[PDB]
Amino acid sequence: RSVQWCAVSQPEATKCFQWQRNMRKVRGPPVSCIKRDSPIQCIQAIAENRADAVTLDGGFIYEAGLAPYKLRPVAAEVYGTERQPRTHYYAVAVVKKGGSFQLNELQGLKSCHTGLRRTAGWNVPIGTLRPFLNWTGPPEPIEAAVARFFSASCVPGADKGQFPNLCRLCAGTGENKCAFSSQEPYFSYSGAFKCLRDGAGDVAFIRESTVFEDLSDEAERDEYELLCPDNTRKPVDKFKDCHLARVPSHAVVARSVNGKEDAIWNLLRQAQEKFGKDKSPKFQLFGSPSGQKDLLFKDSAIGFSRVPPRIDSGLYLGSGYFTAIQNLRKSEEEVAARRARVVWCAVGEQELRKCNQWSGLSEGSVTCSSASTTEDCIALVLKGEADAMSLDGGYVYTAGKCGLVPVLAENYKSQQSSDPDPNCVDRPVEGYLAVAVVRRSDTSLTWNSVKGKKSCHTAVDRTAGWNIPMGLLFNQTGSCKFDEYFSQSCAPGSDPRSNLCALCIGDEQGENKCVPNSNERYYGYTGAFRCLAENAGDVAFVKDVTVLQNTDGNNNEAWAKDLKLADFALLCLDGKRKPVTEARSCHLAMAPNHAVVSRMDKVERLKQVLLHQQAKFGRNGSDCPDKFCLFQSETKNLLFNDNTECLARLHGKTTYEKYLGPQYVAGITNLKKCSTSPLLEACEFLRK
Ligand SMILES: O=C([O-])C(=O)[O-]
Numbered sequence: 001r002s003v004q005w006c007a008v009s010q011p012e013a014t015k016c017f018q019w020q021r022n023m024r025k026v027r028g029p030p031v032s033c034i035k036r037d038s039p040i041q042c043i044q045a046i047a048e049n050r051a052d053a054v055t056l057d058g059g060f061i062y063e064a065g066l067a068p069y070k071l072r073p074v075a076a077e078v079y080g081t082e083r084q085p086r087t088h089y090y091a092v093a094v095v096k097k098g099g100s101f102q103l104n105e106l107q108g109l110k111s112c113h114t115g116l117r118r119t120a121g122w123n124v125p126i127g128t129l130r131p132f133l134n135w136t137g138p139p140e141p142i143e144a145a146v147a148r149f150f151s152a153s154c155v156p157g158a159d160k161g162q163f164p165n166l167c168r169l170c171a172g173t174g175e176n177k178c179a180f181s182s183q184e185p186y187f188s189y190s191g192a193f194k195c196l197r198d199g200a201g202d203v204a205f206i207r208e209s210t211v212f213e214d215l216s217d218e219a220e221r222d223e224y225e226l227l228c229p230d231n232t233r234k235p236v237d238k239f240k241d242c243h244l245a246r247v248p249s250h251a252v253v254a255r256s257v258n259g260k261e262d263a264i265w266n267l268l269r270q271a272q273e274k275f276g277k278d279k280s281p282k283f284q285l286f287g288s289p290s291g292q293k294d295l296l297f298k299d300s301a302i303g304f305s306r307v308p309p310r311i312d313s314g315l316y317l318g319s320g321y322f323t324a325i326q327n328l329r330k331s332e333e334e335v336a337a338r339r340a341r342v343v344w345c346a347v348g349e350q351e352l353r354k355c356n357q358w359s360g361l362s363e364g365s366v367t368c369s370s371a372s373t374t375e376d377c378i379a380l381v382l383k384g385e386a387d388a389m390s391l392d393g394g395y396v397y398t399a400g401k402c403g404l405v406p407v408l409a410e411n412y413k414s415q416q417s418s419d420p421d422p423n424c425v426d427r428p429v430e431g432y433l434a435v436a437v438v439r440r441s442d443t444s445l446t447w448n449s450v451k452g453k454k455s456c457h458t459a460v461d462r463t464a465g466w467n468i469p470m471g472l473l474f475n476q477t478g479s480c481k482f483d484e485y486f487s488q489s490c491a492p493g494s495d496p497r498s499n500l501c502a503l504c505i506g507d508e509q510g511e512n513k514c515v516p517n518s519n520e521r522y523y524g525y526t527g528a529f530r531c532l533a534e535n536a537g538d539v540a541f542v543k544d545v546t547v548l549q550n551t552d553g554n555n556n557e558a559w560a561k562d563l564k565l566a567d568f569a570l571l572c573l574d575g576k577r578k579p580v581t582e583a584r585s586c587h588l589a590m591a592p593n594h595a596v597v598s599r600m601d602k603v604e605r606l607k608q609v610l611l612h613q614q615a616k617f618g619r620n621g622s623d624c625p626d627k628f629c630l631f632q633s634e635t636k637n638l639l640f641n642d643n644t645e646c647l648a649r650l651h652g653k654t655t656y657e658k659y660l661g662p663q664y665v666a667g668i669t670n671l672k673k674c675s676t677s678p679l680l681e682a683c684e685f686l687r688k
């Protein structure tokens, strides 16, 4: 079956045709070409299946990610060199030398841009100069404000109608003037450079390549330089050192659903290899005829790179640049309100309910967001759509790999440095005892003979219930087969078809079996524990407070009502057995305290909001419990552990690595080797 590319022009359809001819020629996968007049029409061809793929600028991957279309990028242009190739470029501000104005002195000058809504020609620069625009906000389109900032401009695609100034130096003819296409001489990255070049403009907003690509001679290059963001002028090659922004390369988007990703990927791979960088005159994928530029793909791209399926437009774009486009549409106050506000990610209904309820008492400082899985919560923090949540030392690793960092850690009752403690915030964290619990009665179960029995775990990927156990057991056999370790388990967030989920029970309705959220009755600390207590598994991987807090009337949920501590025992690594109260000398390992994680941009504020909220809804805080307890769900441990004495200062461990430790870090790494999350795969891709 053939893969239908969408051409947004004549000369692009043409190429696509020559592209066509040499694939079937050369025996390769087939490509059918479509014609349309523009990205949006190309974006609508795709979603009502009238074409399969189209390559697009950052500004449009965005557009394309919106309902009703909702396309997703599947391959990224790679730029640079085979040696040092990249999936990002630099939005630079280029001027001719002789003059001296810096990025702040642009008001009134004439500017040349790539087109309306394009990373480097609109989105980046206008976002950089907002502060000078004196933009009142909606309903007055920013355009209105930029058209008043510069004297004359060329902003292909702007409304000549409403924004005359914006089209003033456009060089096209009649209806071609100021068009979002090749009819307009000053369009895309080379137009905009020609504009500066021809003296129409004063500044051209383009990518770092444009002058070396369009400008043959080095010494010709010497007539231009870059406006750095530090109000300094540096040479055209110090891009790395002087750029407005660093951004995501263009990408082939395609339908999320019935994408035909395979094919696209396969056609690109092949086409890549056959007609890629000087591999076949017979036809060139990244070269356009003389007079033309960037047909289909970006002249001088060096290939394509797959985009890991966890990624959408929003995560493809990056927190920074994604929210930045959003912002071209909100007053300065609404943007500022969003920043003072801490959006919390809630995992499930229950956690969502409590979050709300806090929301109401935060006095607008805390609002709620939600997901049905932790990882889906780390993905919203990344799209800047949520901002914080408390994670197990297991998710601080993933998050860490993703760029998020530990802000504050939950603090639990001490090494008995004691007292109901006044200086907990400054009190250094102590870790928690990851233990292995079994019923007193199974006198013959030991560390050494647990293997093969049925286990109960909090969820896959957490310290206590997965990483510590599974890890002690993996050292010994090197078996990546974590599902043969125990006969049938309850390890939420595993294949509900697999063994790992055989004893899980979903909800009160036998629904949600083996899901990583509170809906599963056997999920988390308390849930792994009750999986034992109802003799579903034989060993549970929890912490010791779990047994204490859930036995001896400590828990008055029927399941737990009659259990007494004396019926439980902990398995020592030594082959011994011990009473729960002896966990200090009888535990598998010491786990690091859950930590609240956030993007780096939001740390100080988060600090604040949380240090203030705990004064009021904390353990020994004000409105608690007349009004609300932040740290009480009652054994559900929603949003935080019910045993958090407080939220304490980091003491410099403020990188998932300093925080977690060489050891712990080493360990997850090994285990993740057997397989990694689609989510860790995605972040790997956006990191490099
Ligand atoms: O990034 C840009 O400015 C473009 O693609 O025109």
Ligand SMILES: O=C([O-])C(=O)[O-]
Residues within 6 Å of the ligand: 392, 393, 458, 459, 462, 463, 464, 465, 466, 524, 525, 541, 542, 591
């Ligand atoms: O450590 C664990 O298993 C947890 O925090 O759920």
Ligand SMILES: [Fe+3]
Residues within 6 Å of the ligand: 057, 058, 118, 119, 120, 250
């Ligand atoms: Fe671009």
Ligand SMILES: [Fe+3]
Residues within 6 Å of the ligand: 392, 393, 462, 463, 464, 591, 594
């Ligand atoms: Fe934990």
